[PDB]
Design an enzyme around this catalytic site. Structure first.
Site, PDB file in Angstrom:
ATOM      1  N   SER A  10     -64.168  37.887 -77.639  1.00 26.83           N
ATOM      2  CA  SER A  10     -63.604  38.584 -76.556  1.00 26.83           C
ATOM      3  C   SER A  10     -63.690  37.752 -75.190  1.00 26.83           C
ATOM      4  O   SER A  10     -62.960  37.830 -74.437  1.00 26.83           O
ATOM      5  CB  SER A  10     -63.965  40.132 -76.265  1.00 26.83           C
ATOM      6  OG  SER A  10     -63.591  40.456 -75.057  1.00 26.83           O
ATOM      7  N   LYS A  24     -60.779  35.676 -73.773  1.00 21.99           N
ATOM      8  CA  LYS A  24     -59.808  36.028 -72.857  1.00 21.99           C
ATOM      9  C   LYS A  24     -60.084  35.499 -71.662  1.00 21.99           C
ATOM     10  O   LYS A  24     -59.123  35.176 -70.727  1.00 21.99           O
ATOM     11  CB  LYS A  24     -60.104  37.734 -72.544  1.00 21.99           C
ATOM     12  CG  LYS A  24     -59.580  38.565 -73.620  1.00 21.99           C
ATOM     13  CD  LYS A  24     -59.997  40.033 -73.354  1.00 21.99           C
ATOM     14  CE  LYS A  24     -59.669  40.886 -74.672  1.00 21.99           C
ATOM     15  NZ  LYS A  24     -60.511  40.868 -75.871  1.00 21.99           N
ATOM     16  N   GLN A  62     -56.922  48.218 -79.516  1.00 22.86           N
ATOM     17  CA  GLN A  62     -56.423  47.553 -80.392  1.00 22.86           C
ATOM     18  C   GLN A  62     -54.714  48.104 -80.692  1.00 22.86           C
ATOM     19  O   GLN A  62     -54.476  49.141 -80.525  1.00 22.86           O
ATOM     20  CB  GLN A  62     -56.978  47.703 -81.880  1.00 22.86           C
ATOM     21  CG  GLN A  62     -58.413  47.591 -81.916  1.00 22.86           C
ATOM     22  CD  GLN A  62     -58.816  45.834 -81.482  1.00 22.86           C
ATOM     23  OE1 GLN A  62     -58.065  45.221 -81.745  1.00 22.86           O
ATOM     24  NE2 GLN A  62     -60.290  45.734 -81.664  1.00 22.86           N
ATOM     25  N   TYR A  66     -59.042  48.963 -71.283  1.00 22.41           N
ATOM     26  CA  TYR A  66     -59.258  47.675 -72.024  1.00 22.41           C
ATOM     27  C   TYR A  66     -58.412  47.452 -73.312  1.00 22.41           C
ATOM     28  O   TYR A  66     -58.567  48.292 -74.200  1.00 22.41           O
ATOM     29  CB  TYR A  66     -60.792  47.589 -72.053  1.00 22.41           C
ATOM     30  CG  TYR A  66     -61.232  46.305 -72.611  1.00 22.41           C
ATOM     31  CD1 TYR A  66     -61.027  45.036 -71.938  1.00 22.41           C
ATOM     32  CD2 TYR A  66     -61.681  46.273 -73.917  1.00 22.41           C
ATOM     33  CE1 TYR A  66     -61.302  43.815 -72.587  1.00 22.41           C
ATOM     34  CE2 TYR A  66     -62.146  44.955 -74.477  1.00 22.41           C
ATOM     35  CZ  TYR A  66     -62.144  43.990 -73.813  1.00 22.41           C
ATOM     36  OH  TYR A  66     -62.579  42.708 -74.310  1.00 22.41           O
ATOM     37  N   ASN A  77     -56.613  44.737 -76.129  1.00 23.13           N
ATOM     38  CA  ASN A  77     -56.180  43.383 -76.895  1.00 23.13           C
ATOM     39  C   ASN A  77     -54.683  43.312 -76.832  1.00 23.13           C
ATOM     40  O   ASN A  77     -54.364  42.239 -76.475  1.00 23.13           O
ATOM     41  CB  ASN A  77     -57.052  43.250 -78.079  1.00 23.13           C
ATOM     42  CG  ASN A  77     -58.386  43.145 -78.119  1.00 23.13           C
ATOM     43  OD1 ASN A  77     -58.574  42.453 -77.088  1.00 23.13           O
ATOM     44  ND2 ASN A  77     -59.114  43.812 -78.960  1.00 23.13           N
ATOM     45  N   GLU A 108     -65.077  39.938 -65.350  1.00 24.33           N
ATOM     46  CA  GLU A 108     -65.543  41.263 -64.321  1.00 24.33           C
ATOM     47  C   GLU A 108     -66.481  40.522 -63.320  1.00 24.33           C
ATOM     48  O   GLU A 108     -67.301  39.804 -63.495  1.00 24.33           O
ATOM     49  CB  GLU A 108     -66.343  42.094 -65.082  1.00 24.33           C
ATOM     50  CG  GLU A 108     -65.471  42.716 -66.342  1.00 24.33           C
ATOM     51  CD  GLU A 108     -66.193  43.727 -67.218  1.00 24.33           C
ATOM     52  OE1 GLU A 108     -67.484  44.002 -66.979  1.00 24.33           O
ATOM     53  OE2 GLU A 108     -65.518  44.345 -67.932  1.00 24.33           O
ATOM     54  N   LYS A 140     -68.632  38.278 -68.481  1.00 25.36           N
ATOM     55  CA  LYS A 140     -67.951  38.650 -69.514  1.00 25.36           C
ATOM     56  C   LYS A 140     -68.404  38.689 -70.880  1.00 25.36           C
ATOM     57  O   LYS A 140     -69.399  38.020 -71.221  1.00 25.36           O
ATOM     58  CB  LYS A 140     -66.935  37.756 -69.923  1.00 25.36           C
ATOM     59  CG  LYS A 140     -65.534  38.172 -70.916  1.00 25.36           C
ATOM     60  CD  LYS A 140     -64.769  39.397 -70.446  1.00 25.36           C
ATOM     61  CE  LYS A 140     -63.874  40.070 -71.499  1.00 25.36           C
ATOM     62  NZ  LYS A 140     -64.848  40.811 -72.454  1.00 25.36           N
ATOM     63  N   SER A 157     -67.253  41.833 -77.836  1.00 26.04           N
ATOM     64  CA  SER A 157     -67.250  43.254 -78.385  1.00 26.04           C
ATOM     65  C   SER A 157     -68.792  43.354 -78.590  1.00 26.04           C
ATOM     66  O   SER A 157     -69.417  42.460 -79.367  1.00 26.04           O
ATOM     67  CB  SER A 157     -66.314  43.253 -79.412  1.00 26.04           C
ATOM     68  OG  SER A 157     -66.539  44.613 -80.048  1.00 26.04           O
TER      69      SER A 157
END
Length: 359
Positions: free
Chosen positions: A64, A67, A120, A150, A152, A272, A312, A315
């Site tokens: 993740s 991103k 998802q 949040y 995807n 973040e 960041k 997952s």
């Protein structure tokens, strides 16, 4: 080695190394960058079956953290004038014109505020055609722009639009434009055959080797693979964007601008953002089930925090990726593994190290 080398090695040995036995993790790479000096610690095995040790060439899945590269690509396209964040996706993906999703703007997609996109895709959305049908059939729920969930699919659609605006596939945006501009040498969306011997296997909870199979629109959400040296270069670029050519400098800076607030967390593009110093509890709260899994009302920002830091996670149920940097201290940290470590453990270990390193 230098006193800094030894000090940093000791801190990483003390705070990250014990996680290997605690979670039965085969391989780990931990890097620190401070004042343009890089410190790299490698532990364990890239491949158990091959007894190949983790090293500076080992390619890990970023999960993740990918991103952050989608965010940088979007900042790059925006600052070239290829997109505006006020545009809607049907301007670029023409089959979405005159559908409800064409009422959501690109910034809202990038920052998870469409109001009806979950973590998802539904299980039945398995192919590229089916992704397009899903987006054509989408209807809003929560007031657009008001709730962060949040997602995807949300940032995946953003990444697809960014690619369309640049007239090339998403993998080529990263591999031909973004990665070279960041000076990365061994970062990939698709690992080439000549690098497969460097590509770490992942390991499930049964410690069986697993190799990601792509999902539809997966690359902008979780599809990047990289080495520790490359990830330290990426952190260097985030700490010192002014040293880079304008197009990528503007892109990096674009990803640092907070776009709204949820409690003590500011959502930037990918990253973040927090006021520095952030308490450990603030950093842990950003990873809470409430923040990660549920909708949360956003608040517009009057001004960003005066002094900032960024992180960041991957997952919490995937592997062990975590990145964090603090501009005022000219310091950052990267952790990569090939086995699940709870996100709270990643955050805590990095907190201890960054709080202890001498200037």
């Amino acid at each position: 080695n230098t006193p800094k080398d030894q000090e940093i090695k000791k801190l990483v040995d003390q705070n990250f190394k014990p996680l290997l036995e605690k979670y039965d993790v085969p391989g780990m790479a931990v890097g620190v960058i401070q004042n343009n000096k890089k410190y790299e610690m490698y532990y364990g095995l890239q491949s158990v079956q091959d007894k190949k040790a983790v090293n500076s060439s080992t390619i890990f899945e970023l999960g993740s953290v990918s991103k952050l590269f989608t965010a940088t690509a979007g900042g790059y396209a925006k600052n070239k004038g290829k997109i505006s964040f006020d545009d809607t996706p049907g301007k670029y993906w023409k089959e979405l014109k005159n559908t409800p999703i064409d009422q959501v703007n690109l910034l809202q997609l990038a920052t998870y505020t469409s109001g009806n996109l979950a973590l998802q895709f539904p299980d039945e959305v398995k192919t590229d055609q089916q992704v397009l049908t899903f987006f054509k059939d989408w209807k809003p729920k929560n007031s657009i722009g008001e709730y962060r969930q949040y997602s995807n699919p949300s940032i995946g659609l953003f990444g697809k639009v960014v690619a369309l605006s640049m007239n090339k596939p998403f993998d080529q945006v990263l591999e031909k434009t973004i990665f070279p501009a960041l000076g990365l040498k061994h970062s990939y969306v698709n690992v080439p055959k000549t690098q497969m011997q460097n590509y770490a296997f992942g390991y499930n909870q049964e410690n069986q080797p697993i190799r990601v199979n792509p999902g539809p629109l997966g690359a902008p959400a979780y599809g990047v693979k990289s080495t520790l040296p490359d990830m330290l270069s990426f952190i260097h670029a985030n700490l010192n964007p002014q040293k880079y050519p304008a197009d990528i400098q503007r892109a990096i800076n674009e990803t640092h601008q907070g776009r709204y607030q949820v409690n003590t967390m500011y959502q930037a593009l990918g990253w973040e953002e927090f006021s520095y110093p952030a308490t450990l509890q603030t950093l842990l709260d950003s990873n809470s089930e409430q923040i990660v899994m549920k909708p949360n009302k956003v608040t517009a920002i009057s001004k960003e925090p005066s002094v900032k830091m960024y992180h960041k996670t991957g997952s919490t149920n995937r592997f062990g990726t975590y990145v964090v940097f603090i501009p005022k201290e000219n310091i950052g940290l990267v952790m990569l593994t090939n086995k699940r470590i709870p996100n709270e453990e990643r955050i805590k270990a990095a907190y201890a190290v960054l709080n202890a390193i001498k200037k």
